[PDB]
Amino acid sequence: ASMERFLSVYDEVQAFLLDQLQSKYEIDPNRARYLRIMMDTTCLGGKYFRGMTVVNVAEGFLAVTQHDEATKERILHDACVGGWMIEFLQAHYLVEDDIMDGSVMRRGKPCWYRFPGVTTQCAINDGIILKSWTQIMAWHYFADRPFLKDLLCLFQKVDYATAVGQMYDVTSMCDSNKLDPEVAQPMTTDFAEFTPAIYKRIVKYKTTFYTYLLPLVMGLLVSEAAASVEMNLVERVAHLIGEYFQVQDDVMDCFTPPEQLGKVGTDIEDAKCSWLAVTFLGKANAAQVAEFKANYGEKDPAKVAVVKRLYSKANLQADFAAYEAEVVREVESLIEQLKVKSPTFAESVAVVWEKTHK
Amino acid sequence: ASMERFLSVYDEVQAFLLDQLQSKYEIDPNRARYLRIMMDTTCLGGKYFRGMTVVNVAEGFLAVTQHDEATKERILHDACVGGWMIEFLQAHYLVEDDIMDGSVMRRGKPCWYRFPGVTTQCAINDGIILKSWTQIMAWHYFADRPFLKDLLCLFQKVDYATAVGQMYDVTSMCDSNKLDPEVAQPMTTDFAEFTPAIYKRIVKYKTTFYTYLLPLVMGLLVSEAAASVEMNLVERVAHLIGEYFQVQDDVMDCFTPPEQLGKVGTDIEDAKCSWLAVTFLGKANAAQVAEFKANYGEKDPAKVAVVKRLYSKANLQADFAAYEAEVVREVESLIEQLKVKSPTFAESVAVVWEKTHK
């Protein structure tokens, strides 16, 4: 089964990385153990959605393409290694983002930097190592592959887009005209930059390239199937589903119980440009806008409660339903367009959408 | 002249990166200005020793190889872009290291994260962007080059070695057997791991791969000259000169005036495994070892003063002279061995050594 293959490959790649640290980097057993625990704590525990998308896209093509059994095994192993490169890339950004944001919990456990024996001094570098491991995986496992060049180039572009998206996210509550490294940044008072187009830019870059575009294209590359698809359609469907995924996350930050969320959501306190805040400002009257401005971005729990009441009273569930209906309509249209050149790839996209939507 | 070409290429690469952010990443002018200032503040102001080594190695080969003038210009431009990849890689590690270490100043100015309009939340990501820019440079400028694969593979290996070296450095005052992410780390009390071999491991990985190996090998790659040298000799001379460079830095941290150093050195307070501490413990009597243990790794200025007195009284200048004489002897021996296959490359190494030694 796909998941068991994927998890077995994690143990293989971990053993390869740690054994290389011992044979080539002069590591001692205690530091190798620290790095093993860091890898497990930061890479494991999630749903493996991104990595398993690579595997599922590759399985779709195997079902319809003639190959010797050894070639089928090679392609699946490559899809698993590629999927772990994306999981380790995500692990890098979660470790760093948690330190940047001063976060407390991630997936029901303390953020890595908060572990007593880690601290920010080590965790920033541990995050650097996580992303370096993605490149060590690629050069080792894909050394003789025809797709190595395209895969590394895609991966770099996606990583850069993600870092640019993090910049857009962390500065989303500043007035753009005031940004200046030499001057402490005040929070926006007018919220003029909390618009659907600005929110779409943040989300497109901060999450959609690594959560949807990279796994789908990597599945095509390891399958040597990229010429069988219209790349512009793949980008459009990846950016569309990815935005919906971030809207779901934004709603959950505000209203999903902390036990289910795996943390205490603080987007209101952090003055984030969330879908809820943009959608609220898109329908609020003058008194509602004024109440929002007087309470948003404040740690005071009573102020956070005022904001959640404004969102609840504004009936944002109706705006979410209209948005969800439009996304269902557009994703189904793109899936139809993908069937022109590849019904197998269109089906993988339908699975990815179904898993996101539910 | 070499320096003017190198600086002109910085402006070209900066314009390329920022123009790409506008045409492909939807950046606005204010964020483009923030990134321009971040690039200038974190990449410029140093001696450009690493980047200029690439240029000097390439100039050496141009002097003895037949090429059309357009090819000479292409090779020099590539050497400048490669040199800036290494300068931006260093910029990434300085930004992150300063945050990890809680540093105050770097090159006579505040550390980047301390700028009022930056903060740790932005600076960690700015550091991530600096390293991503090295890959954008490579894929753009070297897209059609025969050396692209080897250059990217070398660069990844050097980056990984550096991150591993940072782990060795940050944990150098812990007892290895006590390292555990779940347990807050006490400082060593026995200093048994402050040995010449453990110090050599820290230094080899944390600085020598990116400061000496990477510039020398990159100069060979852009010149298509790597088969003209014995790679094992290049590694040995790079690791040897690089260690001497770090010993010089360690002595300067303790005894160079802050105005000349560009910061207030705090290796004693930070309990670093410095050359001074290892060399002191290698010659101290029992009472001197006990006094060192009672004062090292403490913020108290009177305790720091006791350590500097112990170092001064131990006549560490005599150990430095013996070490320096041994390094001069070994670097000259390796330069001689390099002349067997390439007198031009051996001369570049002699220049690199001369610039380091003085």
Ligand SMILES: Oc1ccc2[nH]cc(CN3CCN(c4nc5ccccc5s4)CC3)c2c1
């Ligand atoms: O999650 C937390 C943890 C601790 C906390 N303490 C106080 C808070 C509540 N907010 C106070 C204001 N604010 C700001 N953000 C920016 C970003 C850019 C420019 C100006 C501002 S003003 C976010 C945090 C909080 C939240």
Ligand SMILES: Oc1ccc2[nH]cc(CN3CCN(c4nc5ccccc5s4)CC3)c2c1
């Ligand atoms: O004032 C508060 C504070 C905390 C609270 N926790 C739960 C609640 C009660 N409802 C508030 C509104 N709601 C939403 N569901 C969606 C789904 C999609 C998009 C927007 C929304 S809005 C369901 C829960 C509540 C109220």
Ligand SMILES: Oc1ccc2[nH]cc(CN3CCN(c4nc5ccccc5s4)CC3)c2c1
């Ligand atoms: O530069 C500074 C800035 C602020 C400061 N405050 C106090 C100090 C002085 N030292 C106190 C002890 N110490 C430790 N390091 C480690 C690392 C690993 C394991 C245990 C320890 S115990 C370094 C700092 C200091 C220095």
Ligand SMILES: Oc1ccc2[nH]cc(CN3CCN(c4nc5ccccc5s4)CC3)c2c1
């Ligand atoms: O007690 C103190 C405290 C601060 C101080 N600043 C300057 C001093 C006075 N000398 C102390 C020793 N020295 C060193 N030069 C080298 C060079 C190579 C290797 C080891 C050393 S040791 C020169 C300056 C001093 C003393």
Ligand SMILES: [Zn+2]
């Ligand atoms: Zn964040």
Ligand SMILES: [Zn+2]
């Ligand atoms: Zn969120």
Ligand SMILES: [Zn+2]
């Ligand atoms: Zn450091």
Ligand SMILES: [Zn+2]
């Ligand atoms: Zn130093």
